[PDB]
Amino acid sequence: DVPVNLYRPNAPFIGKVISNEPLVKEGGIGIVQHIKFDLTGGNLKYIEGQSIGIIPPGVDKNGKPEKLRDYSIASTRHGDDVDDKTISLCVRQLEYKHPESGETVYGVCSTYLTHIEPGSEVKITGPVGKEMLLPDDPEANVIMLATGTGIAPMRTYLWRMFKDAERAANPEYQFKGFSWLVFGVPTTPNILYKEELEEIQQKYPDNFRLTYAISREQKNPQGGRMYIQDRVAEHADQLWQLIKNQKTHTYICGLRGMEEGIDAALSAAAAKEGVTWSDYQKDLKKAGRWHVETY
Ligand SMILES: Cc1cc2nc3c(=O)[nH]c(=O)nc-3n(C[C@H](O)[C@H](O)[C@H](O)COP(=O)(O)OP(=O)(O)OC[C@H]3O[C@@H](n4cnc5c(N)ncnc54)[C@H](O)[C@@H]3O)c2cc1C
């Protein structure tokens, strides 16, 4: 039922870019693009929580072809237009430091993708992933802990849950549980999909809670910058109570290293009731209720 490896690196699907939109508003930090591809002409199917591979053009420094990079799918199974013809990605351009040979370094695949033109052909493989899948139980609670481009799988869940067109397209899934996104970004113009996230929250104030951790605008109790582990510590007892429900699924996505501050906060909460969090969490992973994808 879960499509996997419909296309592989030795014979990739050749899609076409339909659009390439900026997500970072003026005054923000960096470049994050929303890129939509045309899937017509092939049989690429996917569901929510999966990834695809992109094979960038060119050779490395040794003259060898560039390998694929993985990207979380940022659209539901139906695509943004709910026509089952497209797939979207949420791609940040990577760039960095002088302690790494010379001046500024730009990432190969992320630069390629963020500057790609409509009409261009792209090599796509996949889909892959069974770790970040959404339960078909419409009464599930869904906690979502994302930083930056980790919003991508969260967007596929929330759109499936709350978009009018999706609800009309998925008769089997009419969500009536509770979902909570805690979203860590550096500035307000860096809140990816801010307007659509806040529109969901106003239509479904009982089913969706939105919490931001904006580090350049908010300070934590110790006077430091507000990060997502600070918000999670702030709400640790509430999050723990929701996690005790047999229906609750937790998803964590973003850059590696966000997991340690989340566990330290949930450990202190669980300890209050004599529960050892690290042992409890192993049973949650075994049960398929604890989903992690950091990179
Ligand atoms: C499952 C999965 C899902 C992903 N989803 C997404 C997504 O939705 N959106 C997205 O933008 N990315 C996503 N990523 C990362 C994406 O995989 C590519 O790794 C990332 O875009 C950078 O690739 P690059 O090709 O731009 O190239 P590269 O040119 O390959 O650069 C990466 C290399 O440069 C180095 N490097 C990186 N940062 C620094 C730093 N600050 N200081 C020093 N050296 C550094 C490391 O050696 C690293 O191997 C995902 C990764 C995985 C594994």
Q: Is the CB of 90 under 6 A from ligand 1?
A: yes
Question: Rounded to the nearest whole angstrom, what is the distance from the C-alpha of residue 232 to the centroid of ligand 1?
Answer: 25
Q: Select from 33, 258, 22, 229 the least CA-distant residue to 149.
A: 33
Residues 6+ apart with CB under 8 A from 272: 237
Output b/e per residue, 242-278; b: 16+ Cβ within 10 A.
bbeeeebbbbbbbeeebeeebeebbbebbeeeeeebe
Phi, psi of 157, rounded to the nearest 5 degrees: -65, -50
Residues 47 and 92 in one domain: yes
Residue where the block lists tokens 């990179």 = 295
Residues 172 and 261 in one domain: yes
State the Cα angle at 101 between 115 and 117, rounded to 5°. Answer: 5
Residue ending a domain, choose from 74, 99, 128: 128
Q: Residue 284 in 3-state DSSP?
A: helix
Q: Is the CB of 70 under 6 A from ligand 1?
A: yes
C-alpha R_g of the chain = 19
Residues 80 and 34 in one domain: yes
Q: Select from 136, 172, 139 the least CA-distant residue to 248.
A: 139
Residues 145 and 284 in one domain: yes
Ligand 1, atom 19: nearest CA belongs to which residue?
Answer: 69
Two structure tokens written together for 76 = 């539901």
Ligand 1, atom 1: nearest CA belongs to which residue?
Answer: 70
Two structure tokens written together for 254 = 């973003």
Q: Is the CB of 293 under 6 A from ligand 1?
A: yes
Residue ending a domain, choose from 96, 128, 160: 128
CA pair distance 295, 279, nearest whole angstrom: 24
Ligand 1, atom 52: nearest CA belongs to which residue?
Answer: 70
Q: Is the CB of 72 under 6 A from ligand 1?
A: yes
Phi, psi of 72, rounded to the nearest 5 degrees: -60, 135
Measured in angstroms, the resolution is: 2.3
Two structure tokens written together for 45 = 């199917």
DSSP 59: B
User: Domain of 219: which CATH number?
Assistant: 3.40.50.80
CA 242 to each of CA 134, 267, 273, 278, 290: distance values in angstroms, whole numbers, following the listed order: 17, 14, 14, 17, 13
Residues 74 and 186 in one domain: no
Would you say 33 and 25 are in contact if contact means Cβ atoms under 8 Å apart?
no
Atom of ligand 1 nearest to the CA of 70: 17
Pocket test for ligand 1, best of 94, 104, 124, 255 (most atoms within 8 A of CB): 94
CA pair distance 107, 94, nearest whole angstrom: 5
Would you say 211 and 191 are in contact if contact means Cβ atoms under 8 Å apart?
no
CA pair distance 147, 139, nearest whole angstrom: 26
Q: Is the CB of 196 under 6 A from ligand 1?
A: no
Q: Is the dihedral of CA 264, 197, 248, 134 positive or negative?
A: negative
Residue ending a domain, choose from 104, 128, 152: 128
- 25 is in which domain, residue-wise? 1-128
Enzyme catalytic residues: 71-72, 253, 293, 295
Residues 184 and 294 in one domain: yes
Ligand 1, atom 18: nearest CA belongs to which residue?
Answer: 69
CA pair distance 270, 288, nearest whole angstrom: 20
Residues 62 and 157 in one domain: no
Number of compact structural domains in the chain: 2
Residues 149 and 282 in one domain: yes
User: Domain of 56: which CATH number?
Assistant: 2.40.30.10
Two structure tokens written together for 36 = 């939509």
Q: Is the CB of 108 under 6 A from ligand 1?
A: yes
Residues 154 and 290 in one domain: yes
Residues 138 and 3 in one domain: no
Residues 19 and 156 in one domain: no
Which amino acid appears at position 62 of this protein?
N
Residues 179 and 234 in one domain: yes
